[PDB]
């Protein structure tokens, strides 16, 4: 998949790095575009990788 996504506040202080494995943990926490692209690919998704 790749490097993954990062979480931030409006504070620009704390950032939380996510692995490509743990995307499906945060789920809807990502922006609606990320969710719309992500949800269909959960069918073919594996732990680190997409088939």
């Amino acid at each position: 998949l790749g490097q993954g996504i990062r979480l931030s506040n409006k504070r620009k202080t704390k950032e939380v790095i996510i692995k490509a494995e743990k995307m499906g943990k945060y789920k809807n926490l990502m922006r609606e575009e990320y969710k719309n692209l992500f949800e269909p690919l959960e069918k073919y998704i594996q732990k680190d990788v997409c088939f």
């Binding site: 506040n9 409006k10 504070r11 620009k12 202080t13």
Partner: protein
Amino acid sequence: WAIKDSDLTGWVPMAEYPPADNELEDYAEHLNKTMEGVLQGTNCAREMGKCILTVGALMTECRLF
């Protein structure tokens, strides 16, 4: 009786919140919003409000007449 929340929401005039920067005023503004939200609903806030409003009314009435 003064401990439990009355059906009316709040009795005490409280001014607006100032503009916020991420660091502190987020914490301060949030803490004030929560604490105010809890204490406004109580009957104790009711007696506070009536005391402020009516004793203020008398205070004006002593200069008025």
